[PDB]
């Protein structure tokens, strides 16, 4: 499913990401844009056997278990397939485990390079929340 930016911003706020660990809501919407272009079914096989899944591109070597990735740690303790849904719950919940402090969004390369330093709030202005 491809979320509109406003529809996603509203869902992520309802799931507690607004100012989570000090990160304004726009950071999360921006990260989702550059990680999965707002698509919940998004997938990307990396050079190393790990594949990223869902709206927030959760990694299969460290966070979710796809049962095909060597060195799999499954820190979110969840099957990767559980992260490819219209409902963003599982993905938000794992993202919250990932972001343990105020540097945690660096977990997403797309965010560190393409969102950090930009007006992430631009992604939510005009959205009803």
């Amino acid at each position, epitope marked *: 499913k491809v979320f509109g930016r406003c529809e996603l911003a509203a869902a992520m706020k309802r799931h507690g990401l607004d*100012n989570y660990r000090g990160y304004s809501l726009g950071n999360w919407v921006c990260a989702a844009k550059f990680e999965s272009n707002f698509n919940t079914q998004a997938t990307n096989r990396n050079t190393d056997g790990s594949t990223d899944y869902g709206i927030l591109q959760i990694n299969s070597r460290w966070w979710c278990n796809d049962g095909r990735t060597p060195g799999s740690r499954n820190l979110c303790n969840i099957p990767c397939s559980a992260l490819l849904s219209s409902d963003i719950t599982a993905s938000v919940n794992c993202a919250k485990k990932i972001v343990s402090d105020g540097n945690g969004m660096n977990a997403w390369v797309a965010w560190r390079n393409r969102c*950090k330093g930009t007006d992430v709030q631009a992604w939510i202005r005009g959205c009803r*929340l």
Partner: antibody
Amino acid sequence: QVQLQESGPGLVAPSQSLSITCTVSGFSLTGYGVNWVRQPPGKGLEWLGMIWGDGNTDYNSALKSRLSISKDNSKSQVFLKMNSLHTDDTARYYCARERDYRLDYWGQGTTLTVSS
Amino acid sequence: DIVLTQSPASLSASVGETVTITCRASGNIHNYLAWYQQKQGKSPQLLVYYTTTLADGVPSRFSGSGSGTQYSLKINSLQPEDFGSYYCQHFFSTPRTFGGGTKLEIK
């Protein structure tokens, strides 16, 4: 450690322009915005403008025509240029780092006096 | 532009008392309001951001509240080091603006 220090002319001729430098350290200018704020002696804080991590700039509406902010990421320096110096531009000028919509670190500031 | 109206201009109180400062915005700033404290001869220091979050090291006696167009900073049982000035600033789009400031003074 995150640090910011302003450097400036001190006294400038109203028949001249202004140029203030903000040297930062402890962070990359590419990842944080830097706002310029002034405060006339004994008065409040006034927002001048900002340069985002990505280089975009935004300015105080009323002063926009006289203001210009730019930076050199590699040199970790942000610049404020102001022209048409009225005596009312006399103030302590500060540059502050913006981290996700809050000015978390401020320089000590630099005092500017608009002469005759 | 969005203008911030900060009241009162001055406050006279004694250590142990609880004070409140308001800042109302001419337009909805959607929680993007921060507060700063500035002591005599010093630069402003961040106290609260995104309306209610205390900056690191800021004593819990400080609490921010608000939404939409109205916000306030409350200092519970203020202490010697609280005396000085306070300013609110909004971060909803640009340009940004500050409230008029409030001078908290020893009674």
